[PDB]
Design brief:
Largest sheet of chain A: 8 strands, parallel
Shape of chain A: globular
CATH architecture of the largest domain in chain A: Alpha-Beta Barrel
Helix content of chain A: 25-40%
Bound molecules: a molecule of 6 linked components (NAG-NAG-MAN-MAN-MAN-FUC), a molecule of 5 linked components (NAG-NAG-MAN-MAN-MAN), a molecule of 4 linked components (NAG-NAG-MAN-MAN), a molecule of 2 linked components (NAG-NAG), 2-acetamido-2-deoxy-beta-D-glucopyranose
Radius of gyration of chain A: 21 Å
Strand order of the largest sheet of chain A: 7-6-5-4-3-2-1-8
CATH superfamily of the largest domain in chain A: Aldolase class I
Oligomer: homodimer
Structural class of chain A: alpha/beta
Distance between the termini of chain A: 34 Å
Number of strands of chain A: 17
Chain lengths: ~400, ~400
């Protein structure tokens, strides 16, 4: 969606994975989804410098709305959990330098059941716009056919541009056309800032493995249409939670970087490890994901419970990922042909590789002939940045 | 196996999971299985107080032997990787206050391929005994039928006791009778200090889940025959490695404690996290696993992605585990009937519960009536210790 937005992958926070749809504010006020929750996370994003690092979007997922439209027919924030209403919330958020994102839905209901947006797109768009929203995650649950679907998506898209307000549009469009017919990604790109491809994500290594495995076994259709304006969105960064290990979390960050993926955390920034905050704010890595160019990386090598991913950056520089899929044993060692890496380019004839994950080290120079060897921790990853002597 | 050994679960170290069968001492030496490696690991077990915490057995798994028997017909440590034969190593190990454990095999070959022990049990036993071994992990790969198998196990058992040397006998016997007939566990208990049940283990949460789930859905046959002399062995503690998250590692330790399981680490005590060393050496937990009584815990409750496990200890005290199987979301909260927990016992009249994992806290006193409530992290666990009093 060429609306001059997301000219780099989007970076923010989304409550879904960490908080799902929690409403028992009686016995669980702190996990309970309420303007108080977001009101807090927002303060923090500024506090421990999340804004400073790159995350700027505070987005609300499903379960923020009240049972049904108002007299006028518009949507409404739950009376009890969102008394002051989005506008005022957006205001605060803005007051603190951030941008507010909201959840919607093309069908008759959100996946949560709350009101849909069928035959409301227009009304809704103006409402969000009016409210002062900055991003809309348009979910796709509940709708007859692709007819109603595909059109709902394209429609709402136009609606928004219409309102005049600059709103990042996150579609879940593809995810739903599967499995009925591969979607015409080029088209979808003309209506969305970024879209979902594979299912949702659990705070589990399995879930991450699968996402990579699927995205990998499909770069053909997706890896291409990626670029400024529209990106492929795997799903939130579940780093900071509990299901992942050290070598597992780095993998996710490292690889989300390689896939020029939207960086959306989903954890509790109130109680998050320092070791993890470190990773998530790693200037060097955020920098690779935020590469101005906008060329989505991809999987280069397979075999030997080893995966080699690479992404071309700006200025004859490339970023390479080394994932070790061997669930057991110790840290193995992989060695390849420096030459045949950056599509022949980077390292031709001078490369200056510097480990950037898990330890930001400074490896020497590498000639076209040179061979690169690095040990990789189980379920771990090694992120490198190659520079050409030019 | 009533040989006066393992009157409490065995605690030690086994290279398998962490080092598997590494032999390229040319381009991967630190992973390379050599007398050099163990020598180091042994020094450390004393250094960072692993001995002090409870681990006392330094055991060598498969791939320690040389291609084939010597002239005499005895086994022999690989010439290159184990120059000083074994014995001396045993001596260095014995020096550091530790005990040496070795890998063998009932069939014609070890799962690695190296020499077996078929029609050698006797010779081999005397050899190990002579070498100064303290524990034998008898693996069961390569053998015609249960005939050769079941007898190989029972035989070697006697052989060892014969040698006169006090040797812990770890059998992988059951793991092999399936697919044929559930093992006569009571019989196996008459020949082993502890045995393997379910398959091997990966540095993965999946692998741990499965072991628990398989074990859970089987306590009927195993949970019982467990006690001093013989225990059910799930497999090495993969804590300290990389496949497990924090909340995930506690689960493993907490639950190995509940299953009066042999505690055998399999990690590199050289580059191991402090946060992890802490857990593994937790005096309080090691204490529960090492409970003198010897009553294996079990799974008590199921449903709605929550598991409640409990184990009776000594002195009207029980240990309870709270696993949250929900792979996603945030930390949920579980609440139960204090009364209906320690089989009704613990908490009659009073109970003094103290969280011991993941944070060793001190919860107040609980009456039989009382209700206990605790939040649990995804794939995590909460280990509690209930004491019976009457304040
Ligand atoms: C370790 O490997 C050993 C070798 O086994 C494999 O197969 C052989 C053919 C080679 O290729 C070898 O390289 C392979 O590794 C294996 O040794 C074998 O042990 C079995 C069981 O003891 C023997 O089978 C029996 O053979 C007899 C014939 O002679 C035997 O009996 C006499 C009298 O007791 C002994 O003095 C001999 O040493 C032999 O042991 C058969 O009679 C009998 O079969 C029955 O059914 C047949 C077929 O219908 C009838 O013809 C017979 O009358 C019987 O009623 C058994 O099959 C086998 O001979 C022996 N092989 C060798 C080379 O010694 C050993 O068991 C393996 N150990 C483990 C744990 O796997
Ligand atoms: C409704 O839909 C219409 C149709 O798409 C939108 O119209 C677009 O409006 C945006 C608003 O900014 C226009 O964006 C501008 O595009 C220029 C074209 O450059 C592009 O291509 C070059 C060459 O490859 C790239 O180098 C460059 O990155 C762009 O991808 C840009 O040059 C403009 O520059 C921006 O960045 C520079 C540098 O920092 C700044 O100096 C500028 O101020 C600016 O921020 C800018 O991106 C776009 O051209 C319009 N498209 C069309 C087809 O007309 C409406 O915006 C939309 N309405 C709403 C409310 O969203
Ligand atoms: C080969 O097998 C034989 C028989 O299976 C085995 O002999 C057994 O040795 C154990 C080891 O002590 C005996 O069990 C003990 O029995 C005594 C009284 O019978 C108990 O008091 C023991 O517990 C207490 O006493 C111990 C001894 O000092 C203390 O260390 C401990 O703290 C307790 O206070 C324990 O139950 C068992 O009775 C014999 N069995 C027979 C039939 O004699 C022998 O050890 C094996 N040989 C080798 C070389 O392993
Ligand atoms: C996906 O949709 C796009 C948008 O229409 C298709 O590309 C257009 O194809 C028509 C031919 O009917 C051309 O006249 C347009 O110029 C094309 N648009 C662009 C932006 O190139 C595209 O062909 C569709 N993909 C598939 C596989 O059908
Ligand atoms: C498992 O093995 C045990 C013993 O090895 C069997 O129990 C024996 O049963 C006979 C029957 O009267 C008794 O006289 C013996 O005293 C028992 N032995 C022992 C050690 O208790 C048992 O039957 C076997 N189980 C099965 C299912 O076959
Ligand atoms: C919503 O439900 C109604 C009631 O059956 C149906 O007629 C309508 O087509 C549905 N809308 C979509 C987009 O599926």
């Amino acid at each position: 969606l060429d609306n001059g937005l997301a000219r780099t992958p989007t970076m923010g926070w989304l409550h879904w994975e960490r908080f799902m749809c929690n409403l028992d504010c009686q016995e669980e006020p702190d996990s309970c989804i309420s303007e108080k929750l977001f009101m807090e996370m927002a303060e923090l994003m500024v506090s421990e410098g999340w804004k400073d690092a790159g995350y700027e979007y505070l987005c609300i997922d499903d379960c923020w709305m009240a049972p049904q439209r108002d007299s006028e027919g518009r949507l409404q924030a739950d009376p009890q959990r969102f008394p002051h209403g989005i506008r005022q919330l957006a205001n605060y958020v803005h007051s603190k330098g951030l941008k507010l994102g909201i959840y919607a839905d093309v069908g008759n209901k959100t996946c949560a059941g709350f009101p849909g947006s069928f035959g409301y797109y227009d009304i809704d768009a103006q409402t969000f716009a009016d409210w002062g929203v900055d991003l809309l995650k348009f979910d796709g649950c509940y709708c007859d056919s692709l007819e109603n679907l595909a059109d709902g998506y394209k429609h709402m898209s136009l609606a928004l541009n219409r309102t005049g307000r600059s709103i990042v549009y996150s579609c879940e469009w593809p995810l739903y056309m599967w499995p009925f017919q591969k979607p015409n990604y080029t088209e979808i790109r003309q209506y969305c800032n970024h879209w979902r491809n594979f299912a949702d994500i659990d705070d589990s290594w399995k879930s991450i493995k699968s996402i990579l495995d699927w995205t990998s076994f499909n770069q053909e259709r997706i890896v291409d249409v990626a670029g400024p304006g529209g990106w492929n969105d795997p799903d939130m960064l579940v780093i900071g939670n509990f299901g992942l290990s050290w070598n597992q979390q780095v993998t996710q960050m490292a690889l989300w970087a390689i896939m020029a993926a939207p960086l959306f955390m989903s954890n509790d920034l109130r109680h998050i490890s320092p070791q993890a905050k470190a990773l998530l704010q790693d200037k060097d890595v955020i920098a690779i994901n935020q590469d101005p160019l906008g060329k989505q990386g991809y999987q280069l090598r397979q075999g030997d419970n080893f995966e080699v991913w690479e992404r071309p950056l700006s200025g004859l520089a490339w970023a390479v990922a080394m994932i070790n899929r061997q669930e057991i044993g110790g840290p193995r060692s992989y060695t390849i042909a420096v030459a045949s890496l950056g599509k022949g380019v980077a390292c031709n004839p001078a490369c200056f590789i510097t480990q950037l994950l898990p330890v930001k080290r400074k490896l020497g120079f590498y000639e076209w002939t040179s061979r690169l060897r690095s040990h990789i921790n189980p379920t771990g990853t090694v992120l490198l940045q190659l520079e050409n002597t030019m």
